[PDB]
Amino acid sequence: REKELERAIQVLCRRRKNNPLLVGESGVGKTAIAEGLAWRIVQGDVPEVMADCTIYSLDIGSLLAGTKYRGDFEKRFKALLKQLEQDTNSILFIDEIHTIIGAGAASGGQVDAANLIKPLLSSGKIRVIGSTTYQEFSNIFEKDRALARRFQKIDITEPSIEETVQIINGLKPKYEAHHDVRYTAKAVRAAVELAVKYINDRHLPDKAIDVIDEAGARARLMPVSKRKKTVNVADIESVVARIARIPEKSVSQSDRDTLKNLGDRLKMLVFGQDKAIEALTEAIKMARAGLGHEHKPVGSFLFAGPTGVGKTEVTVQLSKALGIELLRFDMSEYMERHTVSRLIGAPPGYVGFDQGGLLTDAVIKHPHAVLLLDEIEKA
Amino acid sequence: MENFTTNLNQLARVGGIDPLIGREKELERAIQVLCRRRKNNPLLVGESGVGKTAIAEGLAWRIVQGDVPEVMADCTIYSLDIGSLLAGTKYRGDFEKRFKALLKQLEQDTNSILFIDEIHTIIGAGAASGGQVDAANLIKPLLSSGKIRVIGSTTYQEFSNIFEKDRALARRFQKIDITEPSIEETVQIINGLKPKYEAHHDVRYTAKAVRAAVELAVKYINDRHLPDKAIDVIDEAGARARLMPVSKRKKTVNVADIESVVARIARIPEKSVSQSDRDTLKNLGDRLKMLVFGQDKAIEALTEAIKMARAGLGHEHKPVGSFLFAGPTGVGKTEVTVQLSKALGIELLRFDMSEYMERHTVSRLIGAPPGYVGFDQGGLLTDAVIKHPHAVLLLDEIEKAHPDVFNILLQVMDNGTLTDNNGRKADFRNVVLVMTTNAGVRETERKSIGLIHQDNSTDAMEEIKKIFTPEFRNRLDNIIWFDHLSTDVIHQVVDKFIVELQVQLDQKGVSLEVSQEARNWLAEKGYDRAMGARPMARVIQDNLKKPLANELLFGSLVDGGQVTVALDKEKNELTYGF
Amino acid sequence: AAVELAVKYINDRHLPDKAIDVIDEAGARARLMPVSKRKKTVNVADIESVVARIARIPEKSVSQSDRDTLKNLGDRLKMLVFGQDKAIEALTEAIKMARAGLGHEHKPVGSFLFAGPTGVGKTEVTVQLSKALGIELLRFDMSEYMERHTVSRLIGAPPGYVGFDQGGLLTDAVIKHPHAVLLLDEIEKAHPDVFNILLQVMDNGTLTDNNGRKADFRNVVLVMTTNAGVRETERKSIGLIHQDNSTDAMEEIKKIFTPEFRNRLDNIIWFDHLSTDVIHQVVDKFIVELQVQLDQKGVSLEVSQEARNWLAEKGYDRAMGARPMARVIQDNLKKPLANELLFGSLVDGGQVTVALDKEKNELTYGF
Ligand SMILES: Nc1ncnc2c1ncn2[C@@H]1O[C@H](COP(=O)(O)OP(=O)(O)OP(=O)(O)O)[C@@H](O)[C@H]1O
Ligand SMILES: Nc1ncnc2c1ncn2[C@@H]1O[C@H](COP(=O)(O)OP(=O)(O)OP(=O)(O)O)[C@@H](O)[C@H]1O
Ligand SMILES: Nc1ncnc2c1ncn2[C@@H]1O[C@H](COP(=O)(O)OP(=O)(O)OP(=O)(O)O)[C@@H](O)[C@H]1O
Ligand SMILES: Nc1ncnc2c1ncn2[C@@H]1O[C@H](COP(=O)(O)OP(=O)(O)OP(=O)(O)O)[C@@H](O)[C@H]1O
Ligand SMILES: Nc1ncnc2c1ncn2[C@@H]1O[C@H](COP(=O)(O)OP(=O)(O)OP(=O)(O)O)[C@@H](O)[C@H]1O
């Protein structure tokens, strides 16, 4: 994070409005950027002007505690700004800065943490570092434009894969000290890559750390006979597949047989129509071996023929045999050009907005499942 | 006035107030309002950072400088600090006592002026659950009598939503609209402010530097107003330049420095081309032509649009490029765009426009209006572009969306802006807009009747013209019609797919080699011009992946080695090994 | 005159306070007017000046440079939008009438429906008008108002709902800049329920948002640009004679907008296609813009007149207006210049020349 810290220090040296606002997605490490700037200050690995200044992390609860008797909060805050003004070598850090947009009385929503710092930030006597997410920044913060213009927004993007690997290698000492385990560098690279591949609803510099911490916590629970061991690609892969629902390594366990005798086991329940079972089993076996499509479903099959010859039967038996939740969607309920609103949800502002989609929520809840669309020609 | 106000004339005498430049009309109006008999209370309103507080403080500054008509002299101005005044008023009656004491001091002075910055803040001081005597009411009688003179300052939104909601207090103040300066006026303002920033940063600004800063802040920074973002760029460049002398890269502030600072603030690329970024574009067409075979004119168009954008001579307020890749299935329309996003290391914004089949789905793109359930969410398109101002926007199968949704892209392609339900303008000047379709293909896959077979080459263009409105097609940068894949293209494609399979294998510690006759046989088996390059990957799948997956999942190839594929001549089958 | 002006120009305050404020401020001004010891009686002109200062409206400025601005406004615009003279004339005459006092009593300065084929200076002349007049341009891309309930965005959300404190976009934009140019781009794309707002905006010059504020349109030049019937204008009719589809597009205009809406439009100016000389002028304008872009990089440029004729003949397409000319200028100059400028001879130095060869129909270049 050389460029982000460099731009933050450039902003902090401005004559007026020297208030960097670190805004990025959730889990990118803006709080980490601020705390690491402090940690660099204590180590002297900072530009000359940025030496000899101490960063204070301001907590709203501790300040807003007990402040009845109108005036108590205003007095507390004015005293805080006073003590901060006399330093010229102190930087105030507010972790969730979108939350200082109100502390005033409910009687008249008025002078609060916002309307009390505007003259101070505009006059450039004190310096504040902020941090917020995009969702809060664009909904709560930049509504007091006079407050938003006093902060210089700094985009904190999520690091790359190898940058994340270097971050994990820098953070490895503390996690190893906490869990009393060791992580191999190859296991770290595998953790970052698998977090990129499978953990889709969290951002990069955090989900890899999550995988590391969970692998360490679990490896501290394996030693039921004191089997402390270093975390390799295998255990971390299993921890990732806990969210991905399918381990790529573990197939060599008591599951290679299930794919081995899947076709014969299904032919024990669906007689005739052998090539359909062949195709389904071969697709599942390819996806399990790792020759699958990196951006496509395990399979996309069209089953045709006269009715009642086992088109749905083979699918339900497959879902049973693989222990996989069958997701059935009858395309007889979708004979209109406007029913897809129940598949994906209604646009914002409409009656069914907060209800969500059927197909999307089903797939999100069951990442590993079978999708069945009966009578696709009916839809 | 002891510990609740700040004597602005004292602060101006110690040089703590920046010099007021221009603003002669507004200052004259403020003086005229101040010299009224009753209700002589000017209210400065305007957008954020246009100079309201600046004008109010420059009034006292000029009073100290003597550049005032001989009626406002000796009138020392006090700025009110509401927090300091409300700090210790813990007990009832105390706030009213100190406020009345301040008002008595001001009234008996008969000469001072109270400048209440953020004057929208005094509509609440009371605590006894109602419409108590609080400062708003405590000053209402005096303004109507003109015994004291008060100057306010509040933004347009604050004034319109909070201040003027109290009609009785509002009618006691005279509104003075502080409009944002022009380019020349803000140039003069920066020229007048130059000594302070130059002494602060120990740098010198060239005149060309100031002019370029103002022009670039006008062009790129579109969320702030003039006299606040130009000096923002200037102060930022000064702070950046002052961090160089520690590395002894000390100089004056040249235009290139201002451009770098602006590119940083607006999060856009300006002059990185001076570095190893010219080579990035130089071999860009080559780097794509080895990932997407055939369809070369598309790579030419994309590369040339990006080159015109990075060189500087692109469009002024239009997207970097707005193309309509039309062609049959599986010819690389989505793939070339994905590889373009990958090559530039720039974020890809993917929008499968088949989920927008209904006219009312536009609320997903630009948000729901005020008063409706999804208001706090905002549009997907606009928020995506605001987060990533430099990106590639890909609209897959745009022909599948409801034809009314293209009117959204109308203004995106023409003016490069798009406003969501909060009034935010998504900036599309650094977005490579690509829309893919197979619109006119079905008409070209037509069998003519008669003795003479007729050329159907123009049917694709006819159908595209019949689908997209003329005012929409009129603003497309180019409509790159894609051709089918030929035999040699199929060879290159099966080679690409074999390389991808070889990487997938290397992931598992296995190696593969395929004979040349085996590659040609794979190319011959699954080649189909009507289906593009997907059936070739399908044939590679059912021919190599299945037997290889059986060898890998069971025994032989667990930690396997060099797998060799060879073609037979007696039967034309494939051989395998370990 | 003070009482009457405070009545009909100041509609946010009540009567026996705004007349008093006019009088008091005029007295204070005449008291500060002795910058040459000049104190006199307050006449009607001083009252009108104070009122125009308060209500934020243009005053009687015939003694100003504004007289000269309005004088050459038509000729100045005609040098930025070539052809389409009748629209520039209607705009300039409406603005002049509004300035001379012979405006409408309670109507916007003008409410014009700019229709016509594509690629012609329809939405462009409005921007150039806002630039020449130096007044703020309020641009509203009406293609985002396809949903019938987006009126809540124009005038705000009613009391009791989430978007209340945000207000309406159009009303707030007007209240901020009462003297402006309102560009409702692509007006035909909005849901028909949106035209009903412009109904009262055009007939009565006012608009009430959710907070009960009155948006005053009496100084706003309302301009709406449309493409109604453009699909018809580009269609070649069946028969030996190809017809003029202009009146067809007018009938489409009539079928889109209700009669009570078309009845209060000051004029429906049907823009016409661009001719060849107009295309030559357009090429010249684009070349000037490109030269400005290049001089921003320290690169000069000159093009032989024959090469400009070649570009015009290459790009001319009446059915598509002046937009394909930008694409042709791009394809023929911007790409070679870009390849020379990024990695080529043109780094940090220009003096590029262009000319047409007659045998090969190509262009020349070089340092
Ligand atoms: N640049 C970095 N270097 C080292 N470690 C890092 C970096 N970024 C993040 N981390 C670590 O990854 C985790 C996530 O980062 P961080 O906590 O700082 O962001 P955040 O405060 O959660 O942001 P937000 O408040 O928007 O959710 C942290 O535990 C942090 O230690
Ligand atoms: N090849 C088969 N093997 C085993 N059982 C079978 C076979 N064919 C049919 N059946 C029986 O027929 C019943 C219904 O079959 P199924 O639900 O799959 O209909 P289908 O093939 O999907 O055709 P459709 O739904 O269009 O009428 C099953 O309960 C099953 O017992
Ligand atoms: N008339 C002017 N001449 C020179 N410089 C100016 C003028 N106005 C403003 N500035 C500069 O622009 C900066 C911000 O403008 P200004 O302080 O006047 O508005 P503001 O009071 O901060 O508005 P708000 O509080 O609503 O954001 C000031 O710090 C000042 O240095
Ligand atoms: N010209 C090509 N050269 C090499 N490989 C290719 C080409 N086109 C496609 N492919 C491959 O075939 C697959 C499909 O490509 P792509 O999706 O970009 O085609 P498309 O034009 O978008 O088809 P559609 O009309 O359905 O949108 C990709 O995996 C891609 O790698
Ligand atoms: N009569 C003209 N003279 C010179 N230049 C012109 C003329 N018309 C258009 N142009 C140029 O061509 C471009 C398009 O012009 P404009 O946007 O005004 O047409 P339009 O009517 O708004 O198109 P549409 O009907 O699709 O909305 C502009 O950049 C403009 O500079």
XYZ file of N, CA and C in Angstrom, chain B residues 25 28-29 31-33 35-39 47 71 156-157 160-161 164-165 170-171 173-174 177 179-180 215 271 273 278 281-282 301 304 307-308 310-316 359-360 362-363 366-367 369-372 375 404 407-408 410-411 414-415 417-423 465-471 473-477, chain C residues 12-14 17 20-21 24-25 28-29 31-32 53-54 56 118-119 123 136 139 141-147 149-150 152-153 156-158 161-167 169 172 175-176 185-186 188-191 211-213 227 230-231 234 289-290 293-294 296-297 320-321 323-324 327 330-331 334-335 337-339 341-343 347:
480
model
N -19.895 42.744 -6.769
C -21.349 42.859 -6.782
C -21.959 42.294 -5.508
N -21.156 44.555 -2.544
C -21.989 45.750 -2.600
C -23.406 45.448 -2.144
N -23.955 44.314 -2.581
C -25.297 43.938 -2.156
C -25.345 43.681 -0.654
N -23.451 45.067 1.594
C -23.374 46.356 2.272
C -24.715 47.074 2.196
N -25.352 47.053 1.021
C -26.668 47.669 0.873
C -27.670 47.063 1.844
N -27.669 45.738 1.968
C -28.581 45.078 2.894
C -28.228 45.435 4.332
N -26.954 48.182 5.445
C -27.326 49.555 5.761
C -28.830 49.793 5.716
N -29.639 48.739 5.669
C -31.082 48.898 5.720
C -31.510 49.383 7.102
N -32.751 49.862 7.191
C -33.243 50.371 8.465
C -33.661 49.242 9.397
N -34.441 48.288 8.891
C -34.874 47.147 9.678
C -34.717 45.882 8.848
N -34.621 44.747 9.542
C -34.364 43.452 8.913
C -33.098 43.501 8.065
N -23.897 27.213 -3.390
C -23.387 25.855 -3.313
C -22.170 25.787 -2.396
N -18.946 53.909 5.594
C -20.092 53.591 6.442
C -19.900 52.315 7.238
N -27.507 25.870 -0.373
C -28.853 25.903 -0.932
C -29.735 24.812 -0.342
N -29.216 23.588 -0.234
C -30.032 22.489 0.270
C -30.365 22.676 1.743
N -32.914 25.447 2.039
C -34.222 25.102 1.502
C -34.934 24.071 2.361
N -34.185 23.219 3.056
C -34.795 22.146 3.825
C -34.996 22.475 5.297
N -35.416 27.981 5.749
C -36.642 28.605 5.270
C -37.897 27.855 5.694
N -37.762 26.688 6.328
C -38.929 26.017 6.886
C -39.530 26.813 8.036
N -37.158 33.248 8.591
C -36.646 33.376 7.232
C -36.931 34.755 6.656
N -38.151 35.265 6.839
C -38.485 36.563 6.262
C -37.686 37.707 6.871
N -34.377 37.667 7.054
C -33.060 37.639 6.441
C -33.180 37.885 4.944
N -32.195 38.592 4.395
C -32.152 38.917 2.973
C -31.226 37.925 2.279
N -27.482 35.486 -3.343
C -27.077 34.278 -4.052
C -25.618 34.389 -4.474
N -23.101 32.867 -6.526
C -22.892 31.963 -7.643
C -21.412 31.630 -7.786
N -21.141 30.450 -8.328
C -19.761 30.028 -8.513
C -19.109 30.884 -9.594
N -8.569 24.867 -15.692
C -9.236 24.209 -16.812
C -9.504 22.738 -16.520
N -1.236 11.226 -18.276
C 0.062 11.253 -18.936
C 0.952 10.079 -18.559
N 1.305 7.672 -20.180
C 1.896 7.279 -21.450
C 3.381 7.596 -21.505
N 3.092 3.377 -23.351
C 3.003 3.406 -24.807
C 3.203 2.018 -25.392
N 0.018 -0.189 -25.257
C -0.936 -0.016 -26.349
C -0.326 -0.427 -27.682
N 0.997 -0.322 -27.807
C 1.648 -0.597 -29.082
C 1.459 -2.045 -29.500
N -10.466 -1.667 -34.294
C -11.332 -0.598 -33.811
C -11.126 -0.343 -32.323
N -7.693 1.253 -31.726
C -7.599 2.626 -32.205
C -8.416 3.575 -31.340
N -6.337 4.065 -28.294
C -5.166 4.867 -28.626
C -5.524 6.339 -28.758
N -6.631 6.639 -29.438
C -7.082 8.020 -29.546
C -7.429 8.583 -28.177
N -6.042 7.629 -25.193
C -4.864 7.808 -24.349
C -3.940 8.883 -24.905
N -3.862 9.004 -26.231
C -3.029 10.038 -26.834
C -3.550 11.426 -26.507
N -4.859 11.555 -26.309
C -5.472 12.806 -25.914
C -6.551 13.311 -26.843
N -6.404 13.043 -28.137
C -7.349 13.511 -29.142
C -8.558 12.600 -29.350
N -9.235 12.244 -28.264
C -10.418 11.414 -28.376
C -11.654 12.266 -28.552
N -12.755 11.880 -27.917
C -13.946 12.711 -27.867
C -13.879 13.572 -26.618
N -14.655 14.654 -26.616
C -14.582 15.596 -25.505
C -15.380 15.102 -24.307
N -39.759 -3.420 -19.596
C -39.550 -1.979 -19.654
C -39.266 -1.388 -18.282
N -39.894 -1.923 -17.243
C -39.744 -1.355 -15.911
C -38.462 -1.785 -15.213
N -35.637 -0.788 -15.804
C -34.677 0.311 -15.846
C -34.369 0.818 -14.445
N -35.315 0.655 -13.517
C -35.063 0.999 -12.127
C -33.868 0.248 -11.560
N -30.844 2.602 -13.050
C -30.698 3.965 -12.549
C -31.377 4.201 -11.208
N -31.961 3.184 -10.593
C -32.499 3.354 -9.260
C -33.987 3.662 -9.266
N -37.241 6.001 -7.953
C -37.448 7.418 -7.636
C -37.641 7.623 -6.146
N -37.563 8.865 -5.670
C -37.839 9.126 -4.255
C -39.240 8.673 -3.873
N -39.352 8.077 -2.688
C -40.622 7.627 -2.167
C -40.915 6.160 -2.381
N -39.984 5.405 -2.950
C -40.228 4.010 -3.280
C -39.194 3.112 -2.610
N -35.167 2.920 -2.829
C -34.547 4.222 -3.047
C -33.120 4.256 -2.513
N -36.996 -0.313 -25.156
C -37.049 0.992 -24.512
C -35.829 1.280 -23.653
N -32.763 3.694 -24.856
C -32.846 5.131 -24.655
C -32.081 5.585 -23.420
N -31.784 4.677 -22.492
C -30.872 5.013 -21.405
C -29.468 5.225 -21.945
N -28.714 6.092 -24.792
C -28.691 7.267 -25.666
C -27.796 8.370 -25.102
N -28.138 8.891 -23.922
C -27.355 9.976 -23.342
C -25.985 9.522 -22.863
N -24.021 9.736 -26.099
C -23.883 11.070 -26.672
C -23.160 12.040 -25.747
N -23.604 12.173 -24.499
C -23.020 13.130 -23.570
C -22.129 12.489 -22.514
N -22.805 11.093 -19.691
C -23.262 11.169 -18.312
C -24.575 10.418 -18.169
N -24.861 10.021 -16.934
C -26.078 9.303 -16.595
C -26.404 9.588 -15.140
N -27.619 10.061 -14.887
C -28.012 10.532 -13.567
C -28.932 9.518 -12.901
N -28.534 9.036 -11.726
C -29.366 8.115 -10.974
C -30.352 8.888 -10.099
N -31.086 8.159 -9.257
C -32.224 8.728 -8.544
C -31.836 9.670 -7.416
N -30.551 9.899 -7.169
C -30.124 10.866 -6.168
C -29.535 12.122 -6.791
N -29.512 12.210 -8.117
C -28.917 13.347 -8.787
C -27.442 13.216 -9.077
N -30.568 -2.224 -38.581
C -31.214 -0.927 -38.723
C -32.668 -0.968 -38.287
N -33.337 -2.099 -38.471
C -34.728 -2.242 -38.070
C -34.890 -2.499 -36.577
N -33.833 -2.905 -35.884
C -33.884 -3.173 -34.453
C -33.544 -1.930 -33.641
N -32.403 -1.313 -33.925
C -31.925 -0.162 -33.171
C -32.413 1.116 -33.842
N -32.891 2.054 -33.036
C -33.475 3.272 -33.573
C -32.405 4.105 -34.277
N -32.769 4.881 -35.301
C -31.760 5.684 -36.010
C -31.017 6.659 -35.119
N -31.694 7.286 -34.153
C -30.988 8.194 -33.258
C -30.061 7.445 -32.314
N -28.411 4.359 -33.414
C -27.331 3.945 -34.301
C -26.480 5.127 -34.742
N -27.035 6.337 -34.691
C -26.315 7.514 -35.154
C -25.156 7.894 -34.249
N -25.136 7.416 -33.009
C -24.086 7.777 -32.070
C -23.171 6.615 -31.720
N -23.286 5.487 -32.412
C -22.338 4.403 -32.237
C -21.022 4.735 -32.924
N -19.922 4.428 -32.240
C -18.613 4.668 -32.831
C -18.386 3.787 -34.051
N -42.585 34.638 -2.718
C -42.296 33.854 -1.526
C -42.503 34.642 -0.239
N -42.815 35.933 -0.338
C -43.129 36.741 0.829
C -44.483 37.398 0.615
N -45.070 37.867 1.713
C -46.411 38.431 1.658
C -46.366 39.942 1.493
N -44.873 43.400 3.428
C -43.518 43.223 3.921
C -42.522 43.282 2.772
N -42.431 46.903 1.645
C -41.625 47.617 2.627
C -40.149 47.293 2.443
N -39.830 46.045 2.097
C -38.430 45.685 1.898
C -37.860 46.342 0.649
N -37.264 49.971 1.680
C -36.144 50.128 2.601
C -34.813 49.906 1.900
N -34.719 48.870 1.065
C -33.464 48.598 0.376
C -33.165 49.661 -0.669
N -31.787 52.564 1.330
C -30.416 52.290 1.755
C -29.446 52.383 0.585
N -29.869 51.933 -0.596
C -29.001 52.001 -1.766
C -28.767 53.446 -2.187
N -28.853 55.819 -0.297
C -28.005 56.373 0.752
C -26.542 56.010 0.535
N -26.274 54.825 -0.006
C -24.928 54.431 -0.401
C -24.572 54.889 -1.807
N -32.806 43.092 -8.578
C -31.757 42.549 -7.724
C -32.324 41.524 -6.747
N -33.491 41.807 -6.169
C -34.065 40.897 -5.179
C -34.590 39.629 -5.841
N -33.998 38.275 -8.511
C -33.027 37.588 -9.369
C -33.541 37.465 -10.799
N -32.179 13.194 -37.377
C -31.093 12.957 -36.444
C -29.815 13.646 -36.915
N -28.884 13.809 -35.980
C -27.565 14.303 -36.318
C -27.495 15.753 -36.737
N -29.994 19.346 -30.346
C -29.558 19.533 -28.968
C -28.300 20.374 -28.860
N -26.669 29.532 -16.939
C -26.535 28.123 -16.605
C -27.476 27.271 -17.442
N -29.747 20.757 -17.988
C -29.959 19.671 -18.930
C -30.637 18.509 -18.223
N -31.937 14.711 -19.271
C -32.068 13.620 -20.228
C -33.381 12.897 -19.957
N -34.431 13.273 -20.687
C -35.765 12.771 -20.390
C -35.949 11.311 -20.770
N -34.898 10.634 -21.228
C -35.027 9.211 -21.510
C -34.985 8.364 -20.250
N -34.591 8.942 -19.117
C -34.574 8.246 -17.838
C -35.917 8.283 -17.135
N -36.908 8.943 -17.719
C -38.224 9.096 -17.120
C -39.245 8.286 -17.893
N -38.862 7.075 -18.293
C -39.790 6.206 -19.003
C -40.859 5.647 -18.078
N -40.549 5.489 -16.795
C -41.520 4.979 -15.845
C -42.465 6.093 -15.421
N -43.917 6.679 -12.741
C -43.770 7.186 -11.385
C -42.473 7.947 -11.169
N -41.700 8.229 -12.221
C -40.489 9.024 -12.054
C -40.777 10.504 -11.860
N -41.977 11.621 -9.349
C -41.475 11.801 -7.996
C -40.032 12.270 -7.986
N -39.256 11.944 -9.017
C -37.901 12.471 -9.091
C -37.892 13.919 -9.551
N -40.069 15.698 -6.462
C -39.843 15.277 -5.097
C -40.860 14.247 -4.636
N -40.551 13.611 -3.512
C -41.458 12.637 -2.931
C -42.428 13.319 -1.970
N -43.679 12.868 -1.928
C -44.692 13.524 -1.095
C -44.335 13.440 0.378
N -42.608 10.033 3.020
C -41.884 9.020 2.266
C -40.388 9.309 2.238
N -39.628 8.294 1.818
C -38.186 8.256 2.036
C -37.450 9.406 1.366
N -37.748 9.695 0.106
C -37.046 10.727 -0.619
C -37.517 12.136 -0.369
N -38.154 12.396 0.775
C -38.707 13.721 1.024
C -37.615 14.777 1.120
N -36.596 14.526 1.937
C -35.551 15.504 2.199
C -34.649 15.751 0.997
N -34.785 14.965 -0.072
C -33.972 15.195 -1.260
C -34.569 16.271 -2.154
N -35.894 16.330 -2.249
C -36.552 17.277 -3.125
C -36.605 16.788 -4.561
N -35.628 17.165 -8.626
C -34.470 17.591 -9.404
C -34.781 18.839 -10.220
N -35.737 22.021 -7.964
C -34.584 22.571 -7.261
C -33.597 23.202 -8.236
N -35.073 26.557 -9.076
C -35.015 27.494 -7.959
C -33.595 28.014 -7.771
N -32.597 27.156 -7.983
C -31.216 27.608 -7.851
C -30.852 28.624 -8.924
N -33.921 16.997 -23.013
C -33.461 16.213 -24.147
C -34.305 14.962 -24.335
N -34.550 14.612 -25.598
C -35.270 13.391 -25.964
C -36.610 13.311 -25.241
N -39.601 12.799 -26.183
C -40.613 11.811 -26.532
C -40.427 10.493 -25.799
N -39.265 10.257 -25.193
C -38.985 8.994 -24.531
C -39.598 8.901 -23.144
N -39.842 10.028 -22.488
C -40.478 10.017 -21.183
C -41.905 9.492 -21.296
N -42.408 8.972 -20.186
C -43.778 8.493 -20.166
C -44.731 9.660 -20.391
N -42.486 20.079 -1.073
C -42.401 20.938 0.099
C -43.261 22.185 -0.033
N -44.079 22.271 -1.079
C -44.939 23.419 -1.266
C -44.263 24.646 -1.827
N -43.010 24.538 -2.252
C -42.303 25.654 -2.858
C -42.778 25.857 -4.288
N -37.075 13.326 -31.392
C -36.912 12.607 -32.647
C -38.200 11.908 -33.062
N -38.644 10.175 -36.580
C -37.380 10.096 -37.306
C -37.306 8.798 -38.101
N -37.921 7.731 -37.586
C -37.986 6.481 -38.333
C -38.754 6.669 -39.633
N -36.551 8.872 -42.411
C -35.495 8.120 -43.072
C -36.040 7.041 -43.994
N -11.802 22.196 -34.165
C -11.795 21.516 -32.872
C -10.590 20.594 -32.739
N -10.299 19.827 -33.792
C -9.153 18.926 -33.771
C -7.849 19.698 -33.630
N -7.456 20.600 -30.076
C -7.005 19.416 -29.348
C -5.512 19.192 -29.532
N -5.021 19.360 -30.759
C -3.612 19.108 -31.037
C -2.727 20.173 -30.405
N -3.313 21.691 -27.799
C -3.201 21.324 -26.394
C -2.007 20.418 -26.122
N -1.445 19.794 -27.153
C -0.286 18.925 -27.006
C 0.968 19.497 -27.649
N -28.332 10.879 -42.062
C -27.723 10.641 -40.760
C -27.156 11.907 -40.138
N -27.309 13.052 -40.794
C -26.904 14.312 -40.212
C -25.397 14.477 -40.137
N -23.335 13.762 -37.522
C -22.548 12.853 -36.698
C -21.582 11.995 -37.505
N -21.954 11.411 -38.650
C -20.969 10.630 -39.413
C -19.763 11.434 -39.860
N -17.176 10.909 -37.286
C -16.576 9.588 -37.430
C -15.591 9.545 -38.591
N -12.518 11.379 -37.687
C -11.796 10.487 -36.793
C -11.016 9.435 -37.565
N -11.714 8.591 -38.330
C -11.083 7.501 -39.063
C -9.950 7.979 -39.956
N -7.612 11.248 -36.938
C -7.274 11.057 -35.532
C -6.481 9.777 -35.319
N -6.775 8.736 -36.093
C -6.027 7.488 -35.958
C -4.584 7.623 -36.429
N -2.819 10.399 -36.696
C -2.202 11.338 -35.767
C -1.949 10.687 -34.413
N -2.858 9.819 -33.960
C -2.655 9.155 -32.676
C -1.483 8.188 -32.736
N -1.380 7.422 -33.824
C -0.251 6.509 -33.961
C 1.066 7.267 -34.057
N 1.511 10.170 -32.569
C 1.673 10.980 -31.365
C 2.068 10.127 -30.170
N 1.513 8.925 -30.062
C 1.865 8.042 -28.960
C 3.281 7.507 -29.091
N 3.547 6.743 -30.148
C 4.863 6.158 -30.414
C 5.201 6.447 -31.872
N 5.987 12.988 -31.107
C 6.132 13.210 -29.675
C 6.755 14.578 -29.432
